[PDB]
Amino acid sequence: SASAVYVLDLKGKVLICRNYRGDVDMSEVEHFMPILMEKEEEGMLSPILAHGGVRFMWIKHNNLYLVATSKKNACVSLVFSFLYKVVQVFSEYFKELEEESIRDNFVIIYELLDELMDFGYPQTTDSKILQEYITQEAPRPPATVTNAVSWRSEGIKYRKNEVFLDVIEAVNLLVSANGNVLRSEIVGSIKMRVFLSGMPELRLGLNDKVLFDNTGRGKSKSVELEDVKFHQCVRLSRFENDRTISFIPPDGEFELMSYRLNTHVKPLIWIESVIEKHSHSRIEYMVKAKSQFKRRSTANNVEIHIPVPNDADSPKFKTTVGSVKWVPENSEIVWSVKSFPGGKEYLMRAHFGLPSVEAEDKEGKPPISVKFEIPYFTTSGIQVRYLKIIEKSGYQALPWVRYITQNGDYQLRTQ
Amino acid sequence: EIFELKAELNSDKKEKKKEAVKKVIASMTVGKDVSALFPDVVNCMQTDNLELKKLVYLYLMNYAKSQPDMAIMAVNTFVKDCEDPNPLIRALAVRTMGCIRVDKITEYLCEPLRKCLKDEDPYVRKTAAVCV
Amino acid sequence: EMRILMVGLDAAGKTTILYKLKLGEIVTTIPTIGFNVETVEYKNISFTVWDVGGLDKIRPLWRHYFQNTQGLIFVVDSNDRERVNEAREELMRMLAEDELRDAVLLVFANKQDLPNAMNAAEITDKLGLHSLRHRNWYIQATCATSGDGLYEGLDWLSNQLRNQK
Amino acid sequence: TSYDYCRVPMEDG
Numbered sequence A: 001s002a003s004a005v006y007v008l009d010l011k012g013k014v015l016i017c018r019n020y021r022g023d024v025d026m027s028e029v030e031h032f033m034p035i036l037m038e039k040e041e042e043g044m045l046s047p048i049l050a051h052g053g054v055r056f057m058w059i060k061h062n063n064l065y066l067v068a069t070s071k072k073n074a075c076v077s078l079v080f081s082f083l084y085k086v087v088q089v090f091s092e093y094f095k096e097l098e099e100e101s102i103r104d105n106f107v108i109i110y111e112l113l114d115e116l117m118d119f120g121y122p123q124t125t126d127s128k129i130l131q132e133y134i135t136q137e138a139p140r141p142p143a144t145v146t147n148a149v150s151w152r153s154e155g156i157k158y159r160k161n162e163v164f165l166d167v168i169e170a171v172n173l174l175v176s177a178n179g180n181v182l183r184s185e186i187v188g189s190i191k192m193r194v195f196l197s198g199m200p201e202l203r204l205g206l207n208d209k210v211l212f213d214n215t216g217r218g219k220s221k222s223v224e225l226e227d228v229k230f231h232q233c234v235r236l237s238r239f240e241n242d243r244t245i246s247f248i249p250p251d252g253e254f255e256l257m258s259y260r261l262n263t264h265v266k267p268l269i270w271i272e273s274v275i276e277k278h279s280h281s282r283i284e285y286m287v288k289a290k291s292q293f294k295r296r297s298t299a300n301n302v303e304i305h306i307p308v309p310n311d312a313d314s315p316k317f318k319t320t321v322g323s324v325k326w327v328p329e330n331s332e333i334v335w336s337v338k339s340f341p342g343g344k345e346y347l348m349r350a351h352f353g354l355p356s357v358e359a360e361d362k363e364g365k366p367p368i369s370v371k372f373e374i375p376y377f378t379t380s381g382i383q384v385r386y387l388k389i390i391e392k393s394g395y396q397a398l399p400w401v402r403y404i405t406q407n408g409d410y411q412l413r414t415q
Numbered sequence B: 001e002i003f004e005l006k007a008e009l010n011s012d013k014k015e016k017k018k019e020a021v022k023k024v025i026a027s028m029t030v031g032k033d034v035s036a037l038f039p040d041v042v043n044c045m046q047t048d049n050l051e052l053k054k055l056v057y058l059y060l061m062n063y064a065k066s067q068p069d070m071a072i073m074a075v076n077t078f079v080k081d082c083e084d085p086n087p088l089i090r091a092l093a094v095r096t097m098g099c100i101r102v103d104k105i106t107e108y109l110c111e112p113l114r115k116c117l118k119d120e121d122p123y124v125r126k127t128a129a130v131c132v
Numbered sequence C: 001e002m003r004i005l006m007v008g009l010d011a012a013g014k015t016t017i018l019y020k021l022k023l024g025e026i027v028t029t030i031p032t033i034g035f036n037v038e039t040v041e042y043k044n045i046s047f048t049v050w051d052v053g054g055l056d057k058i059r060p061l062w063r064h065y066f067q068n069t070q071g072l073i074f075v076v077d078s079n080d081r082e083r084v085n086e087a088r089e090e091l092m093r094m095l096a097e098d099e100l101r102d103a104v105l106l107v108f109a110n111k112q113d114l115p116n117a118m119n120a121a122e123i124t125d126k127l128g129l130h131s132l133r134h135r136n137w138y139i140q141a142t143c144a145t146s147g148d149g150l151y152e153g154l155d156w157l158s159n160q161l162r163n164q165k
Numbered sequence D: 001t002s003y004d005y006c007r008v009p010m011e012d013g
């Protein structure tokens, strides 16, 4: 129950303001950045700032503090998911989100912040449905805003009827400093690109372990879905009954399902390293990179980052495969190898200098974090199986799919 | 300086008052003290255009407490705008009726809100539900 | 092209004859708390009409159209002899301004379908319209549901506006 | 989209 949805600058003046209830006075926005500094410098950097009986919830985009005030007992995750959905809607309109937009596209953004919320309540937050009655180029509102099926306005027609599925692996990993796996989980996300005609219905075929166990085919290759969180479009009770993903799809880009399993198959890229940190002289990185997966796939454009001392100097990089640039902006090396086959080992040996006079504060030990990406390969073993198009017309659509293996936060610890 | 803007506001041409109200809410965006421009932007409100009345509703919302005595001159326009075939302007007038926090105003605002409760198109119904 | 008002005491029929001039209808109208504005394209002159109601709390709210104001129409309510005295005092309170001197007067004798109403000369006697210096005034009998006398007042107004052939 | 797609069966009854 926000009382004023704010967008501030990085200083503390108002880019755009939109109050609803009168519970928070408009003068109360002026205290936000001093409270931010006075709570940030003492370890209490919290998303819920406090000013007497007036609270401050906020998220931080690149140049923007989407501040959301409240005075009573606000439902908090409501307001934060409201603010992230406002961020995603504005990124659907304005492909970048800066101060150049807000102080100049203020014709339409006040109307958006009138539409999204009344008396503190998020009510109509789909981007595509908000497009067809809020334009920057007005009729009656579409009934899709009022209708139960609220993410697909009827009357959409394309000449062909293409549906593109993108299955994205994102391996999260955190290997400890001894050489063992702490956590090998996989956050997978199926992102679909749907161009269909009318009001269709799709039923997705997965090789689920649970659906095969309800059928009687849990002895072939299947995926153990430890948890799945679907989009709003999937009728969840039909999934609760017999693992059935029934949904009226949206138009264009959307995220279908956000699953999260565990997998005790080996890590994809192994990073053994040593650090001979001689004091006040130099440092050595005899790091090796082997791949545990099969010898058929190729890892595109990997970026094996290794954090270095903050004030090192005169780098040398004797490699065998792949370029190095030393990036002192974040004080990191970026060991990049473009074409990376499976099962091979590429060795790299760096060598720096280090200052004589020691620093005032210590530097911290950030982790190695690689940025690999592999197509046509899944570590999970998940395969999509079927996708039925249901339509009163009845036609031949073309469901296309590809398999992407990426990283999530693929960190490996250092010494 | 603002007398020039009030003179643009007291014109009769559409593309003058549209730039006038955009200049008013551009001053209100950075928070320039435009509170003396209340009693004449109330006049340039009953318009056929829709991208303009959202800005005037925005001005009435942001300066409702600011002019507690002059704010009576919107209620007949509210009960006119809550009687339209296009439901968007009705529900817009409804969700602006509720945010105006003046006790002298809310005396006359009950019966059009009652009429907008039992309306057909569910947009204004769910908007009047929040206005309750 | 020229602007005009319709002010006066409440329930005098001014919004009724306003929307009768607009569409040609007698529609349901509440007692007017805020304002009304329409436009009437008559004889190639758009009569921009600004109604301000006559409730007791909104009678001090007349000055905020009196900035940049060209004309005036003061609609009386003939059937209220008790309220015509305070209507005259409100009229003189309006007519005692340094800003309203370009506005000509147009009194519509309204609701002239009852025998309790006065004729178009007795209202002049009750108001004292002969003592109006710098005021081009003109009385006319107007009825709402029939519509007679409205366009005669618009004719006299159009004679006041243009100064040509 | 330099990674090219593959076609899945539609019905799989």
Ligand SMILES: Nc1nc2c(ncn2[C@@H]2O[C@H](COP(=O)(O)OP(=O)(O)OP(=O)(O)O)[C@@H](O)[C@H]2O)c(=O)[nH]1
Pocket: C009, C010, C011, C012, C013, C014, C015, C016, C017, C029, C030, C031, C032, C033, C052, C053, C054, C055, C110, C111, C112, C113, C142, C143, C144, C145, C146
């Ligand atoms: N019989 C009859 N009744 C009339 C006539 N003209 C006006 N009335 C009555 O007078 C009432 C006046 O209606 P309005 O026009 O809304 O009142 P107003 O003069 O605008 O006063 P406010 O709305 O308060 O500013 C109407 O409801 C009618 O019932 C008429 O010509 N004949």
Ligand SMILES: [Mg+2]
Pocket: C014, C015, C016, C029, C030, C031, C032, C053
């Ligand atoms: Mg009236």
